[PDB]
């Protein structure tokens, strides 16, 4: 419709995507907000669905250990699909190498903090995806971190986020 130009540069400074709006609608008729997921929690949540579909397949023929997981889901994925998803093995390797916390309960306690703080969702999802510890060099690296958030409050949440995460 009139070529629908809508020229937006994508940036971390609330310069959003053209399809990835904050507000959508869902199939039930209720309002579907935007969902963003960090690197640590994404790596944690994918294994739930992985073991769920593996035991689901095991029931079909009936009717955190990442060193295990990198070969294990390779075997599961080559069992059902082909061996073309070396790209997916690389994506999950990225998900498991550089996520900020290896375990699950530290990320869960971080989420239990964030549900009470009520921070900006895309901002804190970017913070969870990135792996840093001090807020001023995080600011000098990312101008969104420079301008959106005060450094003192960023540091006072960064230390109680960074104490939980396993250091590398």
Q: Residue 85, interface with another protein (CB under 8 A)?
A: yes
**Residue 168 CA to its chain's centroid (Å):** 19
For tokens 């995507």, name the residue: 17
Q: Which residues between 20 and 79 bind another protein (CB under 8 A)?
A: 20, 26-27, 32, 35-39, 42, 45-46, 49-50, 52-53, 56, 60, 77
* The one segment of 64-72, 88-96, 107-115, 157-165 that binds another protein by CB under 8 A: 88-96
Stretch that binds another protein, among 109-117, 126-134, 146-154, 156-164 (CB under 8 A): 126-134
> Taking CB under 8 A as the rule, does residue 88 contact another protein?
yes
**Contacts from 126-134 at CB under 8 Å and sequence distance 24+?**
126/12, 127/38, 127/161, 128/38, 128/39, 128/40, 128/41, 128/100, 129/38, 129/39, 130/100, 131/39, 131/98, 131/99, 131/100, 131/168, 133/158, 133/162, 134/158
Q: Pick one of 66, 70, 74, 98: the residue that binds another protein (CB under 8 A).
A: 98
The residues that touch another protein, with contacts defined as CB under 8 A, are 9-12, 17, 19-20, 26-27, 32, 35-39, 42, 45-46, 49-50, 52-53, 56, 60, 77, 80-82, 84-85, 87-88, 90-95, 97-98, 126, 129-131, 137, 140-142
């Amino acid at each position: 419709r009139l070529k629908k130009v809508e020229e937006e540069e994508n940036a971390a400074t609330l310069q959003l995507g053209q399809e990835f709006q904050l507000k959508q609608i869902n199939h039930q008729g209720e309002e579907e907000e935007l969902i963003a997921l960090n690197l640590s929690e994404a790596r944690l949540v994918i294994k739930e669905a992985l073991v769920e579909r593996r035991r689901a397949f095991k029931r079909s023929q009936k009717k955190e250990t990442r060193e295990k997981e990198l070969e294990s889901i390779d075997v599961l994925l080559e069992q059902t699909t082909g061996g073309n998803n070396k790209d997916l093995k690389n994506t999950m390797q990225y998900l498991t190498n550089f996520s900020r916390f290896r375990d699950q309960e530290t990320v869960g306690a971080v989420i239990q903090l964030l549900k009470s703080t009520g921070l900006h969702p895309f901002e804190v999802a970017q913070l969870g995806s990135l792996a840093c510890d001090t807020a001023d060099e995080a600011k000098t690296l990312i101008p969104s971190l420079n301008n959106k958030i005060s450094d003192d409050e960023l540091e006072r949440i960064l230390k109680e986020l960074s104490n939980l995460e396993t250091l590398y």
